[PDB]
Amino acid sequence: SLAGAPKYIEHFSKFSPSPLSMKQFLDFGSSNACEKTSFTFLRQELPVRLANIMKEINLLPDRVLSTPSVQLVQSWYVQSLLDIMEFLDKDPEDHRTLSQFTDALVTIRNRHNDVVPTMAQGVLEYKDTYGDDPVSNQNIQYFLDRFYLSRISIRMLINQHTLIFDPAHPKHIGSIDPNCNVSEVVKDAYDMAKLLCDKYYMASPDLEIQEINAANSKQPIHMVYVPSHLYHMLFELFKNAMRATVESHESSLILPPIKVMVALGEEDLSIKMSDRGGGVPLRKIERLFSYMYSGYGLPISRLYAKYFQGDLQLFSMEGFGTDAVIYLKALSTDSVERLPVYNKSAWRHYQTIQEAGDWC
Amino acid sequence: SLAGAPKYIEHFSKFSPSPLSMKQFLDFGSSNACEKTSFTFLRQELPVRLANIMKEINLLPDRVLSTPSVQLVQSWYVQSLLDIMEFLDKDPEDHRTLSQFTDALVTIRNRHNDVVPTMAQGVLEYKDTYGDDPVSNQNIQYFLDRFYLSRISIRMLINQHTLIFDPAHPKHIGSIDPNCNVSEVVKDAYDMAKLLCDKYYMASPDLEIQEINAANSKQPIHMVYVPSHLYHMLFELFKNAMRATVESHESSLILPPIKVMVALGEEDLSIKMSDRGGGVPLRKIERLFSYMYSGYGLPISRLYAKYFQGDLQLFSMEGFGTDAVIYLKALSTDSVERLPVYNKSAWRHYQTIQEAGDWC
Ligand SMILES: O=C(c1cc(Br)c(O)cc1O)N1Cc2ccccc2C1
Numbered sequence: 001s002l003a004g005a006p007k008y009i010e011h012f013s014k015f016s017p018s019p020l021s022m023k024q025f026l027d028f029g030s031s032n033a034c035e036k037t038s039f040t041f042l043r044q045e046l047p048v049r050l051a052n053i054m055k056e057i058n059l060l061p062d063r064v065l066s067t068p069s070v071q072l073v074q075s076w077y078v079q080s081l082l083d084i085m086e087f088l089d090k091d092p093e094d095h096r097t098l099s100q101f102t103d104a105l106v107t108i109r110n111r112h113n114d115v116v117p118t119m120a121q122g123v124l125e126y127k128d129t130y131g132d133d134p135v136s137n138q139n140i141q142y143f144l145d146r147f148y149l150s151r152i153s154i155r156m157l158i159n160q161h162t163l164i165f166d167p168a169h170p171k172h173i174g175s176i177d178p179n180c181n182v183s184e185v186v187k188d189a190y191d192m193a194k195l196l197c198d199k200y201y202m203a204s205p206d207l208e209i210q211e212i213n214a215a216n217s218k219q220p221i222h223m224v225y226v227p228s229h230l231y232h233m234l235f236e237l238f239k240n241a242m243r244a245t246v247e248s249h250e251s252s253l254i255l256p257p258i259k260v261m262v263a264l265g266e267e268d269l270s271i272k273m274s275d276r277g278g279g280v281p282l283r284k285i286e287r288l289f290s291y292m293y294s295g296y297g298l299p300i301s302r303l304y305a306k307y308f309q310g311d312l313q314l315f316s317m318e319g320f321g322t323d324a325v326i327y328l329k330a331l332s333t334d335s336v337e338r339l340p341v342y343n344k345s346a347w348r349h350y351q352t353i354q355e356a357g358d359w360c
Numbered sequence: 361s362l363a364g365a366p367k368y369i370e371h372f373s374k375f376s377p378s379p380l381s382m383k384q385f386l387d388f389g390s391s392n393a394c395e396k397t398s399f400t401f402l403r404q405e406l407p408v409r410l411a412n413i414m415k416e417i418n419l420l421p422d423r424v425l426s427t428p429s430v431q432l433v434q435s436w437y438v439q440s441l442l443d444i445m446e447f448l449d450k451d452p453e454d455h456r457t458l459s460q461f462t463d464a465l466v467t468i469r470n471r472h473n474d475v476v477p478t479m480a481q482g483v484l485e486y487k488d489t490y491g492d493d494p495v496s497n498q499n500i501q502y503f504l505d506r507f508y509l510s511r512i513s514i515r516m517l518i519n520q521h522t523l524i525f526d527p528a529h530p531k532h533i534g535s536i537d538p539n540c541n542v543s544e545v546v547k548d549a550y551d552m553a554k555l556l557c558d559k560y561y562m563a564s565p566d567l568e569i570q571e572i573n574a575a576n577s578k579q580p581i582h583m584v585y586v587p588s589h590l591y592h593m594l595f596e597l598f599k600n601a602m603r604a605t606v607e608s609h610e611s612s613l614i615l616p617p618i619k620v621m622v623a624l625g626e627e628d629l630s631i632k633m634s635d636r637g638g639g640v641p642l643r644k645i646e647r648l649f650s651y652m653y654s655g656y657g658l659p660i661s662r663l664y665a666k667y668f669q670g671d672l673q674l675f676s677m678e679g680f681g682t683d684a685v686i687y688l689k690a691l692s693t694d695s696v697e698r699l700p701v702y703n704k705s706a707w708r709h710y711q712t713i714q715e716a717g718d719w720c
Pocket residue numbers: 236237240241242243244245247248275277278279280288298314316321322324
């Protein structure tokens with residue numbers, strides 16, 4: 001039988017998560033020796049990542065913590081942590097340990113499938129029950145960025161293990177494509193967004209792609225990346241760009257295209273999506289990344305970019321259109337997980353009071 | 361005779377600066393009744409603004425505060441505050457009070473002429489004497505943004521008073537042009553930057569300007585603004601864009617132009633400057649606004665934008681080029697001074713220790 005969950009949470013929250021680079025993920029093998037190594041790694045690392053973020057959940061305002069949906073998500077994290085604790089004393093040499101471990105990871109992944117919308121219901125419950133306040137809102141914003149990035153990282157570890165140690169893409173390493181053709185992903189996201197735009201507006205802007213391979217002008221641009229994450233970001237951006245374009249051109253039969261540039265530099269692989277959808281005033285830009293003003297499409301997309309040391313930035317020109325840029329690291333060695341850690345500095349952010357700001 | 365300066369500093373630092381809108385500045389008259397009102401306003405408001413920022417100087421790390429150049433700037437602020445205290449008991453009805461007051465403001469403006477480079481020498485002295493450290497560096501960054509924005513605001517008040525109550529542009533209200541033609545300022549800044557680029561490189565990119573007046577497509581874009589501030593920002597941006605363009609095209613006789621779009625929306629007047637100067641990796645972008653990595657051209661330009669509720673943002677694409685955007689408020693009623701205030705929230709920022717960050 002197991003100890004009470006808080007004993008495990010306190011134990012594992014003392015450790016810092018260990019960030020892996022894309023290259024490290026990529027250089028992970030599929031042998032028995034490798035599966036045992038993955039097992040011995042994950043039975044420590046997953047509990048560390050679960051515990052670290054569970055400790056930050058406890059720092060949320062009582063108001064948010066008291067909501068049924070936040071309490072529900074907490075309970076899932078507790079059970080998932082306990083599921084892994086069952087493996088602490090198990091022998092990696094026993095093939096049944098390994099197969100049971102993979103089954104346990106699948107069960108955890110499914111348990112947590114609806115975490116994003118469930119947390120969003122928690123935010124709504126807080127607003128409905130108590131009314132929102134600026135202090136709680138700032139804490140929620142800080143927390144959710146960290147919580148969702150933590151979740152992305154945990155899903156990455158689980159997907160890598162289950163895909164490698166249990167199809168279409170045998171050149172992929174788990175969910176990683178060592179030769180991801182960026183323009184092909186751009187086209188896939190455009191195609192899917194076009195289906196949606198065509199359905200509702202009976203029209204959609206065309207796509208124009210330009211590549212700038214600075215060091216090798218002829219060569220198609222490739223990278224090591226998780227294509228599903230890149231797809232997610234581009235699909236969200238195309239939906240917004242298409243909607244803006246059609247909605248700002250109600251009188252017109254001719255729609256300006258969405259232009260995408262893919263640039264490969266020494267350090268960055270940058271993807272800029274430019275539309276002439278009429279733009280948004282600067283005042284309204286920050287709110288596009290707010291969990292409260294919402295529709296977590298944009299904030300979660302930016303977290304995917306940030307997860308491997310990239311970013312997603314918007315700059316609009318009200319009256320004209322908008323540019324969105326996805327910044328990725330060009331090199332797999334620079335693509336290192338960005339993971340929140342529970343410590344004093346973290347703890348300090350939730351320690352805020354209501355007072356006059358430092359500006360007039 | 362006067363009280364010791366600290367007594368005045370404590371008294372006036374209790375008040376918050378009072379931000380004025382561009383419209384309020386603009387609706388200020390030049391009569392005798394108006395000059396007395398300006399006097400009675402400024403003999404309170406200037407001491408409040410001087411005292412508020414002097415209190416924050418005292419919050420700097422001992423290391424920075426101990427430098428000769430920071431001590432020198434402090435001493436100027438003390439004397440300027442005392443100069444104004446001489447007017448506390450003077451009668452506004454006496455025309456000699458008014459003329460002496462204008463003389464005192466001119467003397468203050470001249471005294472403080474070299475504040476920006478003198479503070480920069482203070483930063484260098486701290487680095488040379490002690491070596492820099494991350495905690496002090498963060499405090500310096502926070503402080504200098506506020507200090508330089510405060511200074512901009514004090515110079516604005518002084519220039520308005522001295523220009524109105526003591527030439528080429530009689531349609532200007534002090535330093536304010538109620539009908540500033542934005543493209544004409546763009547062209548002036550380009551011309552001056554071209555002279556510099558031509559001198560050093562014997563070549564420079566051409567300029568292309570496009571205006572998008574969303575609500576009135578034919579009409580040239582105008583605004584209420586201080587043209588010298590807009591010029592300053594554009595001149596800095598053109599110098600950077602030109603240098604990048606020529607330096608990334610050493611082999612070429614044909615230079616890509618710098619393209620400027622001026623867009624007027626419902627709320628924003630946005631100016632985007634686009635170059636094909638080869639770009640900068642994202643990692644190096646933040647540092648362009650750092651006082652420590654430096655060359656205060658960019659950070660001070662962004663402060664001018666922020667001063668009337670605007671901003672100046674850079675987004676590059678490494679391997680291709682860079683876009684810089686100046687965001688201004690379109691309406692004089694939205695163009696309100698952005699002024700730092702000395703209070704608890706302000707005080708808290710300088711209260712930081714060296715510890716592990718909240719990220720891995
Ligand atoms: O500028 C934008 C816009 C916003 C984002 Br985020 C983006 O990634 C691309 C865009 O073009 N919009 C969206 C939108 C939707 C309906 C109507 C107007 C607008 C104005």
